[PDB]
């Protein structure tokens, strides 16, 4: 394992092989932290062989805008990952505030402190902002932010990857690759719902990768676009193939028990994890045995 880097668009590990990671993304941290712990996350490293955890803090809805000390649970899930061995996403997550200048100045001290504590912790990936969304394109909005963000966590981490979201909830990856960054291990994330999204928008992957612009899936899910609306397994399995053919690391969408069906979770399973098959929902289990593969 140890640090990252990237090779033209293909994440590498430290002896400089080609690694995917596969993975599961807390739901909001305010709502969810309660899933998110050292026996949780080992249970998923052991039982389910994720490689990478994404640590979802919501800024809106009641996260760290209005109460920051949820920041404290994105800590515990940094220290249980080191510990563990395991990759973990710090992902600034917006949504509600879909321009990601609206929090830029909180970004920016929060980026500040985190790449100060773990600039040396080969296990943390910075995602940005998970899903600009609105009137809010690549090169007005999104990557003067992102080269803001991005010269903060230099001076304090200067290798790490960071993951810059795109227009249209994280779909947009195209115009990223029209305008790339220049950081050497900076990413674009693609976001998509089995149920909602097709072949349009791996051709935008496609094109963004020809570009030379990588991609990292840090959110997905088994559902359509609402978190909803069932499962959709055949679509799942197409896309998943998809990003294996092009190597391409993911985070499934989410670890929790919330009552809809892109959640992992039944209701009343345990929240430090050791969980039976019957306590995964349809997608947990499709999930788990893919990441196991
Ligand atoms: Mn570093």
Do not use: C
């Not at 080609?18 to 998110?36: D, F, N, P, R, T």
């Not at 803090?57 to 996260?63: E, L, P, R």
């Not at 909602?196 to 992957?205: E, I, M, S, V």
């Not at 840090?218 to 397994?233: C, K, P, R, Y």
């Amino acid at each position: 394992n140890g640090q990252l880097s990237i090779k033209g668009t293909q994440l590498v590990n430290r002896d400089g092989k080609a690694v995917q990671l596969k993975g599961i993304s807390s739901h909001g941290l305010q709502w969810y932290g309660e899933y998110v712990n050292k026996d949780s996350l080992k249970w998923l490293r052991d039982d389910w062989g994720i490689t990478v955890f994404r640590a979802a803090m919501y800024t809106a809805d009641g996260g760290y805008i209005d109460n920051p000390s949820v920041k404290n649970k994105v800590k515990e899930a940094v220290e249980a990952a080191k510990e563990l061995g395991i990759y973990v996403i710090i992902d600034w997550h917006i949504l509600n505030d879909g321009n990601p200048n609206q929090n830029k100045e909180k970004a920016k001290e929060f980026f500040k402190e985190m790449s100060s504590l773990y600039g040396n912790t080969p296990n943390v990936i910075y995602e940005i902002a998970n899903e600009p969304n609105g009137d809010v394109n690549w090169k007005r909005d999104i990557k003067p932010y992102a080269e803001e963000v991005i010269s903060v966590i230099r001076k304090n981490d200067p290798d790490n990857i960071i993951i810059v979201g795109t227009g249209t909830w994280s779909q947009d990856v195209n115009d990223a690759a029209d305008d790339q960054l220049k950081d050497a291990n900076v990413m674009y994330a693609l976001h998509f719902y089995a149920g909602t999204h097709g072949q349009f928008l791996r051709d935008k992957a496609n094109y963004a990768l020809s570009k030379g612009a990588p991609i990292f899936v840090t959110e997905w899910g088994t559902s359509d676009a609402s978190g909803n609306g069932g499962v959709f397994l055949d679509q799942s399995r197409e896309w998943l193939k998809y990003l294996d053919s092009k190597t391409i690391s993911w985070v499934n969408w989410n670890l929790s028990d919330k009552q809809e069906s892109s959640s992992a979770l039944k209701p009343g399973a345990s929240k430090t994890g050791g969980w039976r098959l019957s306590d995964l929902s349809a997608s947990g289990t499709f999930v788990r045995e893919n990441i196991l593969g």
